[PDB]
């Protein structure tokens, strides 16, 4: 699917945004869908941390970035996880679509900004509230966007309003205050 408009635009902000305070020391991508971002992503990263609920998926994605020898993944949800060493880059791309209701989403949040090193930046995005209404997600963008606000303090955003029903989405970059 590289050569659909859409998310070839979607990536291309997500990694603008992850960029934009230059080389990553230690991040962490919190969904990894076919390694597409990761792979573009490692290359950046001094070290990359990358989490996903579904382990065939992990199997899937480490192929693919099987190059790069920075770059470990672990089996496990943004609830459950915790590590020693804080992040400068977390990026949040992909719809936590196994979080259950708003307290969920409030605890993964608190879980992001407690790994979030000072000066550390959050990248978000995903569908729009509406659309992952649409799909029993309970929540999306705006709402997460809230949230995130009430922690960290947002530096940027951009909207990407695609093709269909589905391809429309908001990503959003958040600073943590050190």
């Known amino acids: ?3 659909n408009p859409f998310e070839r635009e979607r990536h291309t ?3 603008r945004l992850s960029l934009s305070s230059g080389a990553v020391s230690n991040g962490l991508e919190i969904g990894c869908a076919a390694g597409a971002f990761t792979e573009k992503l490692a290359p950046h990263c001094k070290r990359l941390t990358v989490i996903d609920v579904m382990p065939r998926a992990i199997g899937r994605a480490c192929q693919r970035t099987k190059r790069w020898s920075h770059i470990s993944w672990a089996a496990t949800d943004i609830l459950q ?3 020693a060493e804080l992040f400068d880059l977390i990026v949040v791309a992909e719809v936590l679509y196994y ?3 708003m307290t969920q989403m409030r605890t993964a949040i608190d879980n992001m900004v407690k ?3 000072p000066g550390g930046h959050l990248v978000f995005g995903s569908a729009r509230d509406a ?3 649409r799909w029993g997600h309970v929540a999306g963008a705006e709402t997460v966007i809230t949230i995130l606000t009430e ?3 947002e530096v940027e955003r951009v909207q990407c309003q695609g093709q269909s029903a589905d391809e429309d ?3 959003a970059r958040f600073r943590n205050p050190e």
């Open 115 to 117: 790994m979030l090193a």
């Open 13 to 15: 902000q997500l990694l």
């Open 1 to 3: 699917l590289d050569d």
């Open 131 to 133: 659309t992952c209404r």
């Open 151 to 153: 922690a960290l303090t």
């Open 169 to 171: 989405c908001l990503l």
């Open 81 to 83: 996880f915790s590590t």
């Open 99 to 101: 979080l259950e209701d």
